[PDB]
């Protein structure tokens, strides 16, 4: 039974959302949630599995404050390597406990409390035998003896050990150099566009940037080291912004903020252009609400001109305080390309791929034959796909050239291959800064 009219007012606030190309994903080193890529649709949902001090909640709050709320936020977990070690000496029959959880059906506790003579070890090695004998834990949990590390091996991927008194300490995330983390997350779902991470180590950050550069995504980082605001020559410093610029990585966005360590200001940057469309926006001068200007960690004052110019050399974006209004300036990737161009290009590939997929897979108007008619069909789809870019105010003109059927080698036809299809579009820029040279005041 339901009433004729069901009304339920709450003294909540606004937060009308908007949908656009790109869905953020936050690579957090957590322990909850079922498998990778849990997901969340509102700040309350992200708080039902994470605490205030938790890294994921910190990132979620910044991205989801703004004003146009992002439709959905993806949260993925890095595979975990819990390590155990006795911190004290084994005393007679002191009770030791730990609970290993894999998949969903694993809550087996483990007690040994067997050190009558002396252990000086033993207990951990005793656990090794016990941990490999449990009927529901025997497969999936790889352990060692040290001189233990309950990792994962085969089938089951998620592991978690927890105790109260003895230890069950450390995290030591297994996911290595992005690739390992990426390979896992790709298997689950590949519908995310914007990627970030909780880790800030140089080894890891440089690994994601190289790894992201291969696929069609954008990496949003945030660094706070001082060694970047002093060097004016690129091949002099070892700062991550310098490392990115030297490697010429065009799919990695760097935002130099002083809160880069304990907070994730890159989340705010993502939520500025993600809700809107792809390419019909400028990631340049942006009034990111909430986040403050890029402060100096030494003086707690806004960055000076030389420091900003040094940052401009490494292409890492900052937050310039122009008319005393915190404005994210530059709006460029580490590779020297404007962010909107990279996003628009990625959208153009997706739209071209989808539109061309229809003829080949869904056989819209039938299978494409290898003559002047078939090539024309391909040109129409490519031309149509580029036309949407023009209507989107991304491009202004395009020019698609296709090969003539008679000029096609016999080898390609036998292989059922069509190459030498080219298009040449002209971008439409945006005025981000002016220079008014006033004549006089005579």
């Amino acid at each position: 039974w339901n009433p004729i009219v069901n009304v339920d007012i709450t003294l909540n606030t606004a937060g009308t959302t908007r949908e656009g190309f790109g869905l953020p994903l936050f690579l957090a080193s957590t322990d909850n949630f079922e498998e990778r890529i849990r997901g969340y649709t509102s700040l309350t949902e992200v708080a039902e599995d994470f605490d205030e001090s938790t890294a994921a909640y910190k990132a979620a709050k910044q991205l989801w404050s703004q004003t146009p709320k992002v439709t959905q936020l993806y949260i993925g977990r890095r595979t975990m390597q819990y390590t155990v070690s006795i911190p004290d000496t084994v005393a007679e029959g002191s009770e030791y406990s730990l609970t290993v959880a894999i998949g969903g059906g694993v809550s087996q506790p483990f007690q040994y409390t067997a050190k009558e003579n002396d252990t000086a070890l033993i207990v951990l090695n005793e656990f090794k035998s016990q941990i490999e004998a449990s009927p529901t834990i025997k497969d999936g949990v790889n352990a060692s003896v040290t001189g233990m590390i309950i990792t994962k091996a085969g089938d089951n991927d998620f592991v978690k050990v927890t105790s109260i008194t003895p230890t069950t300490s450390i995290a030591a995330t297994t996911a290595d150099t992005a690739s390992a983390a990426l390979a896992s997350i790709e298997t689950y779902s590949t519908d995310w566009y914007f990627i970030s991470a909780e880790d800030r180590t140089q080894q890891f950050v440089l690994a994601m940037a190289s790894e992201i550069q291969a696929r069609k995504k954008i990496f949003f980082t945030a660094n706070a080291d001082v060694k970047a605001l002093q060097g004016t020559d690129l091949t002099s410093a070892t700062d991550v912004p310098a490392q990115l610029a030297k490697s010429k990585y065009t799919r990695t966005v760097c935002l130099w903020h002083h809160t880069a360590e304990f907070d994730y200001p890159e989340m705010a940057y993502i939520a500025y252009g993600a809700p809107y469309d792809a390419g019909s926006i400028a990631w340049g001068n942006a009034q990111l609400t909430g986040v403050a200007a890029s402060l100096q960690p030494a003086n707690q004052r806004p960055l000076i001109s030389i420091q900003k110019s040094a940052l401009d050399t490494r292409s890492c974006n900052f937050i310039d305080l122009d008319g005393g209004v915190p404005v994210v300036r530059r709006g460029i990737t580490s590779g020297g390309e404007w962010i909107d161009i990279v996003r628009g290009v990625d959208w153009l590939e997706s739209d071209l791929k989808t539109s061309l997929r229809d003829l080949l897979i869904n056989q819209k108007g039938g299978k494409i034959t290898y003559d002047d008619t078939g090539i024309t069909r391909i040109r129409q789809v490519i031309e149509t796909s580029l036309q949407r870019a023009v209507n989107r105010k991304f491009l202004s003109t395009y020019t698609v050239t296709v090969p003539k059927a008679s000029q096609v080698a016999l080898a390609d036809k036998k292989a059922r291959i069509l190459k030498d299809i080219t298009f040449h579009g002209i971008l439409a820029g945006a005025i981000l800064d002016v220079d008014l040279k006033g004549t006089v005041a005579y």
Partner: protein, 142 residues
């Protein structure tokens, strides 16, 4: 490399419109002249540049041609789509001889054909609009 009606191919919305009538089957036309000169009473002449390049593509397919069902099927689908979705796609016309060198940028389906059943087999004329009938040429700016 002379004009032959057997190589002229037209493609819209990813389909391969074919089965043209033996007589005039394709008819492109701009809806407005390039310039409209205005002549003063004295005799001075000024030119008005028309910022209206829309055109009209008419196709005469014979009724039993399969593309007639394909185009009609698209039209039926396009009526059920919401107002926000697009209903236009570029109208590429290709001819190796270079007789026709015009594109149908943002072409929509304007008018449904008129069925004229008779003793013999007649044609069905599909009329397509366009936002910019762009005339091109093989010769570049040189």
């Amino acid at each position: 490399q002379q004009y032959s009606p057997k190589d002229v191919v037209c493609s819209w919305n990813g389909i391969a419109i074919e089965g043209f009538a033996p007589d005039s089957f394709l008819r492109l036309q701009r809806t407005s002249p390039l310039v409209t000169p205005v002549v003063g009473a004295g005799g001075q002449v000024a030119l008005t540049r028309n910022a209206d390049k829309t055109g009209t593509i008419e196709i005469e397919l014979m009724q039993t041609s399969l593309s007639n069902q394909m185009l009609s099927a698209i039209q039926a689908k396009q009526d059920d789509m919401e107002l926000e979705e697009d209903i236009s796609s570029n109208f590429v016309i290709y001819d190796p001889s270079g007789s026709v060198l015009a594109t149908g940028i943002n072409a929509w389906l304007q008018e449904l054909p008129q069925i004229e059943l008779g003793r013999d087999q007649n044609s069905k004329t599909w009329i397509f609009g366009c936002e910019k009938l762009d005339y091109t040429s093989t010769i570049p700016a040189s």
